[PDB]
Amino acid sequence: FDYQTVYFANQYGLRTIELGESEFVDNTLDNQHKMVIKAAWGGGYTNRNNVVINFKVDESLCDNLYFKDTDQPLVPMPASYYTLASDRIAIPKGQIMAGVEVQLTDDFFADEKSISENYVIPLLMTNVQGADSILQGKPVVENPVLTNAGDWSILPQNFVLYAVKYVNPWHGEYLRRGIDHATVAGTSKDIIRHEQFVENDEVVNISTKSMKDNLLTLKTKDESGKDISYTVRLSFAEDGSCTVHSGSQNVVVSGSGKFVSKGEKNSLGGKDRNAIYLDYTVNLTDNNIQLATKDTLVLRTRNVYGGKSLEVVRK
């Protein structure tokens, strides 16, 4: 009398592809530009059949949905940005879960909007072989809408929306120390940014702009003591070196640098650490401040969560 069923355990997901090196998690798939979407089997205890769950891409699942974070709409990921390994998920006899592989193409990573919440892979299960049913939900109204929880007494679990975004290898949270040779409104001075313990150094975020570029927001004082913000753009080459450029309309910038894996020995927490070293010049033309800076940036953590649930709103 048993009634086997298949479903997607989560309806809204956020996958951040973590390129490069991660300490706390295995990102082999990420470095191959891949992700896996998983389905589950239930309503029984032993799966006696080879189960095949057919699904299709259904772009209308995105209708009327917006990211809670940004208030922008969920956008169906363009077909050329990703390749599904199959049109079905197979859960073999004796197994209770399985997944389908997604290969993200170079097209995905070239899109400037792929560094943030924008594109979504939307899937609907169609039929199932080897189990009685797909968990389609129990509607409390006619014309029910899958993505509107209020339309159901038992929620539908036959679809999933995966928002996808990426970070490049240099993306991370870093501790920064260095020396600025400054000229502030004609007055020259050295600014030493150094705390006795690497642990207490200034915390800064290097975010992703593209496959090669990153952004780093900093501040420096004007002649009045007020803090002036500005953004530098780092652009990385195959060999690990970078050039330094402006990322803010208020600053002209030039320089060079490098990422060195394990460049800092017996650094933060006694472990050897990944670091970025910069030698650069900044002209804050509107504020009359010029800085010749040498910086050391120690990696504290990549600060990425590969998989989270996604908060969406239905305006």
Give the residue at shortest CB distance from Ca ion: 132
Torsion of CA 155, 160, 166, 167, to 10 degrees: 30
Q: How far is the CB of 52 from Ca ion (least distance, A)?
A: 16
Q: How far is the CB of 3 from Ca ion (least distance, A)?
A: 6
Number of residues that bind Ca ion (CB under 5 A): 1
Cβ 68 vs Cβ 139: under 8 Å: no
| Residue 43 or 144 with smaller CB distance to Ca ion | 43
Q: How far is the CB of 91 from Ca ion (least distance, A)?
A: 15
Element (H, E) at 288: none
| Residue 48 or 262 with smaller CB distance to Ca ion | 48
Q: What residues from 124 to 163 belong to the interface with Ca ion (CB under 5 A)?
A: 132
Q: How far is the CB of 132 from Ca ion (least distance, A)?
A: 5
Neighbouring C-beta atoms of residue 150, cutoff 10 Å: 9
| Residue 132 or 199 with smaller CB distance to Ca ion | 132
Q: What residues from 222 to 251 belong to the interface with Ca ion (CB under 5 A)?
A: none
Residue 288 and residue 76: Cα distance in Å, rounded? 46
Residue 89 and residue 78: Cα distance in Å, rounded? 22
| Residue 132 or 195 with smaller CB distance to Ca ion | 132
Q: How far is the CB of 153 from Ca ion (least distance, A)?
A: 23
Identify the CA nearest to 167 among candidates 13, 21, 10: 21
Cβ 179 vs Cβ 192: under 8 Å: yes
- Site for Ca ion, rule CB under 5 A: 132
